[PDB]
Structure 1
């Protein structure tokens, strides 16, 4: 089974509170309390518990004095993490009297309320085609240079995977291994469609979840890259203007939906300052 943590996103609200996406973490070994360390610093007075199936949650009282199982921590808990802007290292330590201490590592990102995100599907959009693997999937040409320059202009790349949770760590390794003419894929969180995280329209629900951790009065999702018409629908209903949605096919032809224009990652990169203007 899966052992790891799905990249976590945290957003600082303009009242200085903190909101985050749900924590999806699994201890594959453990067949129990859970402590946290952020940036190699243990976090005091914060703990998680674990269900029989291995999924973990923050215990939180409701108004009837019953324990609720939250995947999203309170703002007060998140402030104790002492998160820096951007990437942060996070580890979860599950202590068990039978199996001792078990540790998993992951990534947690802190954005501001005015941070602008650029979504990118993985399969068919980064890879050329949409269980046996080696990471040698083919990659559309010139995509690493394009995304690098989007990031350099102040946007934040956010990747989207609909593969089963078993492949999550593989997808992370595939993206960080891409090298094209010296360019690499900019570091960023990989969100997992909630249908793949079973416990107790999916791409659209995930992106609306991400949008809703930002205040209502800003539109945080600037643009999106996909390869199926359902990717365009997911982005539109999460707040992306049609003009900023790009849909690529297996011949690496990119359609800019708003302008109904045929293009490519190379040509979009040449027009980077027009389509992805630099942010202050």
Structure 2
């Protein structure tokens, strides 16, 4: 908190976790790339899973945001399937690295590959994982068991970019009665990642930022699948975004100040503990 205030050498260097999805025709589609090279005034090379990607590169804009030069030359945050196929991604987590050649600066990141039939479970972070940092009791066990049954937890954050790396540590350092938070991408509300390449629509919203994020996530999947199975949040604005994103009302969970989880569709007040007891009824194992 007081580090940025005075150190001042903490502009964001890093990458926001990337999501890629294999379509049924074997093509690849990804969410927008958001990578920043801190205090750099250029080409960028990529290395995935400790393997350099030959003849693929990004450029940087004066403001610091990077993009893919792709001809129809348009500056693209979403690379083409041909670029993404050169990554040779594996299912689940992949290590990705970007090297800006000015000297040479390196940022490491995460890039996830899902199949079009993957079922995701969304979880807000502030107020949903954290308790207004204290964590709600028993969430790690629940989320762990949800992940065991075949779903992929996706975390949602609206914190400024300079807290992104911090946020990754907090989630990954949580321990409850031996359980930990399943690894998954932390998506960022588009209002926290503004740049010339994405001003167009983000600039013109208010509380639809979460909904815009959920639909940017929906659109890397084919329109004929409902990839978002369930949602965890703590404000009614979370439920509204889940509802407009196609999540059935029975799979929307909203926690309040005293850790009471309302299952909207059932008009049932519950808890992470009780929801975990019914994990197989509420989150049935996937084949």
CA distance in 2, matches of 1:269, 1:210: 26
The alpha-carbon deviation at position 30 of structure 1 amounts to 1.1
User: What is the TM-score normalised by the length of structure 2?
Assistant: 0.91
The alpha-carbon deviation at position 29 of structure 1 amounts to 3.1
The alpha-carbon deviation at position 239 of structure 1 amounts to 1.2
CA distance in 1, matches of 2:71, 2:118: 32
2:127 is paired with a residue whose SS is coil
Unaligned runs of 5+ in 1: 63-67, 131-137
Deviations 1:233-265 (A, max 9, x none): 111111111110000011000000000100000
Deviations 1:116-155 (A, max 9, x none): 000000000000019xxxxxxx000000000000000000
CA distance in 2, matches of 1:129, 1:80: 44
CA distance in 2, matches of 1:44, 1:31: 25
2:113 is paired with a residue whose SS is strand
Partner of 1:176: 172
1:108 is paired with a residue whose SS is strand
The alpha-carbon deviation at position 163 of structure 1 amounts to 0.7
Partner of 2:188: 192
C-alpha RMSD of the superposition: 0.8
Partner of 1:206: 213
Partner of 1:124: 127
Deviations 1:59-115 (A, max 9, x none): 1123xxxxx11000000000000000000000000000xxx1100000000000100
1:44 is paired with a residue whose SS is strand
CA distance in 2, matches of 1:128, 1:228: 13
Structure 1 stretch 10-19 or stretch 235-244: which is displaced more?
235-244
Deviations 1:21-67 (A, max 9, x none): 000000003131000000000001110000001100001123xxxxx
The alpha-carbon deviation at position 8 of structure 1 amounts to 0.1
2:82 is paired with a residue whose SS is helix
Unaligned runs of 5+ in 2: 1-10, 197-207
Partner of 2:113: 110
1:28 is paired with a residue whose SS is coil
CA distance in 2, matches of 1:158, 1:176: 13
Equivalent of 1:254 in 229, 252, 261: 261
2:108 is paired with a residue whose SS is strand
Partner of 2:162: 166
Kindly indicate which of the two structures has a greater share of residues assigned to helix: 2
Deviations 1:186-223 (A, max 9, x none): 00000000000111010000000101100111100000
The alpha-carbon deviation at position 17 of structure 1 amounts to 0.2
